[PDB]
Amino acid sequence: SMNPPPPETSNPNKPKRQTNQLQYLLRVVLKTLWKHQFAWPFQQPVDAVKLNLPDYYKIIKTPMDMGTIKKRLENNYYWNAQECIQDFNTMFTNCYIYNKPGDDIVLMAEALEKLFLQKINELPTE
Numbered sequence: 001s002m003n004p005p006p007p008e009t010s011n012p013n014k015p016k017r018q019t020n021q022l023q024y025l026l027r028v029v030l031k032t033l034w035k036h037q038f039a040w041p042f043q044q045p046v047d048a049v050k051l052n053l054p055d056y057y058k059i060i061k062t063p064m065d066m067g068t069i070k071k072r073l074e075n076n077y078y079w080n081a082q083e084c085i086q087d088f089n090t091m092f093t094n095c096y097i098y099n100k101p102g103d104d105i106v107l108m109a110e111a112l113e114k115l116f117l118q119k120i121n122e123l124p125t126e
């Protein structure tokens with residue numbers, strides 16, 4: 001079995017822009033989630049080969065993880081904070097779609113997401 005190629009993190013044709021909101025997403029949001037004790041399953045793409053989950057990529061067609069998000073923030077992939085926010089939301093929603101409610105992995109995604117939303121409430125203007 002095989003894993004797909006990861007989501008794009010470099011593309012010279014895509015316009016990029018630093019915003020103070022993006023900077024906050026990296027400095028504060030990502031940094032804080034990354035260190036949480038339930039971050040580890042979300043720090044890289046789901047390795048469905050290693051995990052013996054051969055249907056994962058038949059079910060989840062827009063994969064996303066905090067590894068990818070960290071690369072997209074550190075090498076400036078985004079034009080705005082909403083694109084980055086959508087990546088986080090995709091990662092969470094994928095977990096809730098693939099797994100069952102009350103699964104441990106779901107409880108872990110849920111704790112991250114709660115923290116994510118708290119941090120998003122302090123997103124600076126502009």
Ligand SMILES: Cc1noc(C)c1-c1ccc(=O)n(Cc2ccccc2)c1
Nearest residue numbers: 041042046047053094095098099104105
């Ligand atoms: C994240 C994620 N979403 O769906 C799956 C499957 C994973 C995932 C990623 C790495 C990963 O190691 N797992 C196994 C695991 C981790 C914590 C608790 C229970 C099971 C699962």
